[model samples]
Target chain A: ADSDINIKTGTKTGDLVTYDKENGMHKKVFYSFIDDKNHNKKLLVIRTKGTIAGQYRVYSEKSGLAWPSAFKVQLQLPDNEVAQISDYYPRNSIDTKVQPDFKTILESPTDKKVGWKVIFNNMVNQNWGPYDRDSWNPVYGNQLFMKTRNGSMKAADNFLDPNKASSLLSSGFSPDFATVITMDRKASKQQTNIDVIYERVRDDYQLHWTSTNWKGTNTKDKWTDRSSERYKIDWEKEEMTN
Target chain B: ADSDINIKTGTKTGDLVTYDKENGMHKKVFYSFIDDKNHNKKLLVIRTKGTIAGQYRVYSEKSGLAWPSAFKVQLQLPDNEVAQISDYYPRNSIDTKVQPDFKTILESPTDKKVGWKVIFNNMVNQNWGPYDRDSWNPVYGNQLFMKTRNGSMKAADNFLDPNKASSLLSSGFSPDFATVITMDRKASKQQTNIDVIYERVRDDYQLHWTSTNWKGTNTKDKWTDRSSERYKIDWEKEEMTN
Candidate 1:
């Protein structure tokens, strides 16, 4: 069945642009797509407020035809990782006109019925093969309605929409904060060179600094420090550069 | 309290729409609003970039069982604006979870809590209202998060969906930029008869241009011009029009 799957990428449109001068901010977007991920062809409409925040819906064909399931790809930053969350209804986090799947995974004593959480967990932990094969768990942080298969690590989508405040506050989290999950790709880390320098201004007008250098030539992990500097008062004659 | 507060307008919905590409481009949206003296019950569910860029959130309801306070309204542009920002947690920026009270106006304090700085100051100067009430602010060159707020001072929404990038990025902001905010009405300078003409050439050298002229009997705003015409020759078929 996997071999019969016709995997293909779709055409993409450029994003629209707009802004809010009042709040000193702005944003970008992506809306719809057509795919057969559910083993059926159909339209997948999406509404996201930001990169990782939004919802998706899959519409079935006009006839007694079946529709494809929808899926979302999440990219965790800073650490840089990837994961997938699908819209199979009863097994996913989306709420829409589509009816949910009643198919459950039977397990343990008393024949317990497993839902979307179990399926999602299996995929993330790589226990569910032929789909995801790595141990990828839900990343933690302050997103809304975001969930993971097997832990207290919950997340939300659209956590910043003011309309979602009352609901978020009820969950015991602050609306002003946001959470993000990341990964550490050691392989990619070795392929690149990175140098970071930090400077701190002291109460006495002195500047303390630190530098970390990593070049492809050396395999050793290390940190280096530089001497501090102090400047005299000349705030009145400040010259700026463009 | 809900009735005494004056329930002027509140529509119900499951989603929000915010964009289009046209007229140098022409947009339609409301970024912020205000009451008499620019204070007021407006909506505030902004679209923003992901933790990085490009995402939006509309918040949900829950908690205290009384968390049913959610509203979403999208305004079309060219003219019309105003709104608010709340503080909600876990899933929104709103800080409260109740039927909003139509009152509250206390002022004066340290200007200390002010620093998202320059990028925002200019925007509020236009239409964000109450918090902003002046044209003595910076309004120049090309920057996205900006628009005139009061009447003749109209603006638009939906300027930043990924699909509008070519047109938007060409204007200077990053492809992930977005600006939304609206306004209240007011009498302005003058009204005049205007004509806008558009041209489309479908040849190997495709070019499109537009022009507008006003023929009203008013001399309030004198047309001023700072001239500089720099040209590059393709040498293929040199013909031009203004």
Candidate 2:
């Protein structure tokens, strides 16, 4: 049955789809460029095969943003072996099928600025790990957890870590990647073109992804067009600093 | 109908009382220092004369925090004239009759620190003022039309200037003052005694009041016992920046 099963990666229509018959699951990850009224955004979709295959997507407010140079899918084999099913570098940008509804969720037409008051009143901060137990640290409790757990003597980066990213992604995932919302005080326009850089930790058997080249406006009307010149992120460096 | 009304301010008990009688409404404003399980807070109560005299309070949350060097009440008379009614300063600290139910609103004993997550979700920012209009700027919209209109860039000083304040006091006149809630993230313990420093504004026809000596903890838990030595605010300086 294993021999009969097929797996490959390329532009042969679904050739990029990866399968894992052993786990009885097939995972699919794809990327696209989303054009929003404000700006062009990047969108990512991750799916797995199962009786009810899990599907997920990532973006700001839903998942920590990422831009990846390349990504590969692997399946665990019976003899402690690993089989690479899909491996590819994103080469094309397609129109996104789904887009965020900014006008309804974050904007107030009369005010023109983000409806921060409405959104903020309902906003709940992310908890990074178990140490950020809701019961233990109440006032900015997560701050304490981030400080103590990361062994940083200074204030911890509130929104710039894998642990924070993972929690953001998980909270927004409805088997489909949930949306993560954030603010950029400098500009009025929203961000766009998010790419997910993917990596798999060999030691812990965990997957790591980070967003890159997601541009937001710093001025009221002026925008950053990264399409002409994409900025690459050294995530390896981010791990150490961010 | 107007002549039947009587209004005055002095201390048979709470000397920090301000009074006004106009529009057939008698306004009374009083200040008090409150003792909390966590710290000492200031409380201000405002009431008006009517069949059922209307009243309201403002402090950290409600009639829950205050210290006043001196406070006075005034009313808008028929001919652009103002009538000064009551005046006095706070002299005592008494146990608050009402307190925020921290256990219900923001705390879980299992988690001992301040419940920031819970509080943040419900937190609302104060609109510096056109008097408090939701449509004008809902995010911090507090500007209100005080039975008068004007266009000014200089922050209205609604809370600071007695003219703007009298308008605010008159607008919410059910014989009561409105409550204002704010936070300081310096420490886990609740902020301490807030003193309102009064100043006579040169530009506007208003008396300015600014809060000082409001201390909040940033550290984990070296809480201050405000009961020991209460510090007062200098309104003269706060006017420079705030």
Candidate 3:
């Protein structure tokens, strides 16, 4: 089980964001309020924030350190990559109309972000066919939403950045955080990628992300580096909240 | 001269955008704003909004009345059409930073929303090559821009719908939008199928649409639909501020 991650945003008072495999995840979100006096307006300072969950698993089925794992979830970009957390709701994310596909949102994944979640599931195979094989490929980071053990991966259609902090006052996320699931996993070393799911509380905003699964016989796999803190492991780093 | 138009974003509360045709040719300008209610937030609304100053031109040199000389600008959706104005930005539009090029913004003379001022400055003549025989008909509509004196034609690029949008965004626009200039017009036409650049602004966002120099003949003896309103008159649509 992963640690539970809880985060709060939009306070001048700074806090610490911690993430370890044991406790889920916790984030301290920072915001920069911009007062464009010329326009008599205040802008929120927000950048792309999200937690890169990491882990190293021993897989006997694949004869390697990692196995066949896939993910599927709903997601949205509260704003652009630079959107604040508060904007993650109401004004920034979720659109009931006009559903989009996976590749549409993953490539941009900000407010321009898009995603989906489905009922059918598939393995993260090694081949991203040179020709048309499936709607998505395991080699490319095409985020999908895997809703069940054998469910299919849907797509995320919308996203929003966090809302800007009101200079006259301060506000935080209505729902400070959304949900991400590892949805499905296949213990195969040949499965050179992993899938993830993102779900925005409001919209069925689900999404997926695949990464280069380490295949080197002696080298540390990508998941190990992410889990071991070889890389910056901050969940709030990729999220936006008021 | 096409009417001078200002591509106003909306009812007038947001930042106003325009492309001033003062410096040798009309050009595009970008504006962003943050009001007190939404301080510390970076909300960028981009469009060619303002007022009209002259006749509307479809940015094509086609003449007479044949087919409406038009181009479809749409947000690069995964499968659907008519997404949203915001959806087109960095996702379907150009990377203002890494791949800033002509397609990212257009130029036209105006300050009003009377009509569109789409600028297609590139010119070409399909009549080419001593080695290429008459049967080797040159396919056009595949360059960064294309223009002809005949009126009554429209344009489109459906290639950028999904594949290109993802690849371009993921590669960080390594070569950028500017590098695809040298390919023959056919290549440009083929690439157009990869993605689209269109968006729907707020209700307040005002729009302008029109066609100029709507005249033509069998300009190209072999091309029959050289003079038809279906390809000649430019179609203009404006979104009034709500």
Candidate 4:
């Protein structure tokens, strides 16, 4: 199902990328962010019915820091006329449980006061997405992934202190919402709070998302896997002027 | 006994501003080096000869990334006057071995071209200086220090695979080197290879030492309590910047 609230994620919308047997485009898309708070806008979209569909949680990492706002993370729902579920189900996803941990996604769009840092802990793993259980899973290699926007980067655990808050700010990373799952289908009659933040680095904008997907033999039966993805990735290694 | 040759380890002259406890002064001391075949200067340094000392092998994360040059690390006895085998040595002192683990020590530097990593394995513990084998004799916290001219400002691990060389590099925040002991004796050893790279952010060089020192015990004839003064330390962390 769909929702009336359409959240405009990143401005860097080019092509609709997908994955195949080879996984060439596995986690290929990457979102970038500037060192500014104003540009870091998170949209919370909702779809009453949960579970009937899956979603994703998007995030970014610079240096040892995590920047959820820098990259625009959103969900790409299934085409119309797929499978529809009722509105009485509460949507559940690994990213939703770990949503609170993303409050400290470091993205210093201000000054390099003290280069940023954030730890990629258990919560990060949870927020990243589901691992193998459902449509959600770890990145292709089951490895930790960190990306930087606008040539800005730092250590992954730069200011990651599982026990503090300010370190979260100094690190420059954030999540749209905490523990709120947006309904995957329409007419669910439930409150789907999908808080997604998108950021613009330089020439293009990036997208990231936190959502759930269906699992098992059929669509609506239950979520089999879950995960996160990136969009509008320009720079690769060398040339930064994209 | 001292080495047949000069065992010419470079000299480092610095000051230890204070000694509060738990934390020590931070300094930037480079090790010795010589001209290399590529005309690029080769950095020279050695592992600490404190508590955990032994021969170490060189390992690189990604075969052709980047590492130190002509990093010939070894331990020297200084002079014969400092070498003596006392028949009835003080039970509280003398008997510990201060050998260095050349294997785990990564005396190399890394560039952004690709990810480079260095790891120290095959850890064997032993006593250094006056071996105190009692409740609290001497040799409380033995370590393996390094003397280097240049290193990374921050620790980095970049490889298709990280189990080998990148293990330590990939380990951010809670670095394993902290567990490895390396006492930076401020006197003669100026260039200390504290960690892979000592980053100086915001005018503050957070010089981390894979340096470690364990409290010794007087299990045998001698049983004495040691103090922090005996623990491994960084000469720079102990001195004032001039």
Q: For each predicted model, how many residue pairs clash, with residues at least 3 apart or on different chains?
A: 83, 62, 164, 116
lDDT of 4 by residue, A1-242 (tens): 00111111111222223443321112222223233232212112122111111112122341221222122223322323222111111111101101132222221111101011122222233245421111212222221232221222233333223333222322333322221111122233322111122221111112122223211111122221223332221222211111
In terms of lDDT, which candidate is stronger, 3 or 4? 3
Candidate closest to the true structure, highest DockQ: 3
Whole-model Cα lDDT of every candidate shown, in order: 0.17, 0.20, 0.22, 0.21
Candidate 2: how close is chain B to the reference, as a TM-score?
0.17
TM-score of decoy 4: 0.20
| Cα lDDT tens digits for candidate 4, B1-242 | 12455676321212111111221111111122223344322222222111111111123220121121111122112222212111110012233553222223332222111111112222122112221111122333211111111333333321122111111111111111211112322335443222222210100011133345222221121111111221122333332122
Q: Model 3 over residues B183-213: C-alpha lDDT tens digits?
A: 1222222211112221111011001113533
Candidate 3 vs candidate 4: the DockQ winner is: 3
Docking class of 3: incorrect
Tens-digit lDDT string for candidate 2 (A1-242):
11111101000012133333422223333223333333212223223211211111223341222211111121111212111111111111111111111101111101001111000011122444222111122232222112122232322232334443333222221112212111222334432322221121111011121233121211111111111111121221211010
Model 4 has a clash total of 116
Which candidate model has the greater lDDT, 2 or 4?
4
Question: Model 1 off-target regions past 4 Å?
Answer: A1-120, A123-132, A135-242, B1-30, B34-49, B53-110, B114-242
Model 3 stretches astray by more than 4 angstroms: A1-28, A34-42, A48-56, A64-242, B1-242
